[PDB]
Amino acid sequence: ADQLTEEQIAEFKEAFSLFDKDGDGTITTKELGTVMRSLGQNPTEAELQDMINEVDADGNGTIDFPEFLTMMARKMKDTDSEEEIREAFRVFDKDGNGYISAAELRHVMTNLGEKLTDEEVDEMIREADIDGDGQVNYEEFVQMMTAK
Amino acid sequence: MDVFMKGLSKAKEGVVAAA
Ligand SMILES: [Ca+2]
Ligand SMILES: [Ca+2]
Ligand SMILES: [Ca+2]
Ligand SMILES: [Ca+2]
C-alpha cells in the first residue's frame, strides 16, 4: 500500500515547522542559510540559489509546505537522491583523498553524538569492501547503495 | 539545504538496513 495517509503527513509537518523559524509556513533563504550556518558552513547566495531554484515551482524564491512535501516523497522517485549520494561522499570523505579511511568515518559520527564499537565498524568495512582495496571509493560507495 | 534535508531520510531508514 503506497497510498499516502493523512497521519503520516502530520508526522513530518511537525518537523517542517522547526526549519521555518518565521512561522509564516514558508522557508526563506535567510532562514535556511542562518540554520545551515550552525552546521559550521559558509555558503554563498549563488550556491543556495541553484539548490532552492531547482525545486521552486511557484518561482517565489521560497519553499512552500507542499513543495517540501513533494521532496519528502521524492525519495521514492530517487530523483535528487543521485545528487545527495554524490554530495554525501564529499561530507563523509573529510580527507578528500577520494577514499574513505576507517579513522575518518568515526569522526563525523562522533560530532553527531553517535558512536559504535570497533568490531561494528570493522565488520561494516569488510562487508562494503568489494574491490578489496582496503578503502571505500566512489565506485564502492555508489555501487553499495544501488542494491535491490 | 533542500538536498541536505533529503539526506536525513537516507541516514534514517537507509542506515536501518544495517541491522
Ligand atoms: Ca519564512
Ligand atoms: Ca517556491
Ligand atoms: Ca578520507
Ligand atoms: Ca574496498
Residue A85 C-alpha cell reads as 549520494
Contact A135, A100 (CB under 8 A): yes
Residue owning grid cell 579511511: A101
Q: Is B2 annotated as a binding residue?
A: yes
Determined by NMR
Contact A74, A66 (CB under 8 A): no
Residue A102 C-alpha cell reads as 576507517
Kindly identify the ligand whose nearest atom is closest to the C-alpha of A16.
1
Residue A125 C-alpha cell reads as 568495512
Contact A124 B2 (CB under 8 A): no
Residue of B nearest to A127 (CA): B18
> Residues of A at the B interface (Cβ-Cβ below 8 Å)?
19, 32, 36, 39, 43, 48, 51-52, 54-55, 63, 71-72, 74-75, 80-81, 83-85, 87-88, 124, 145
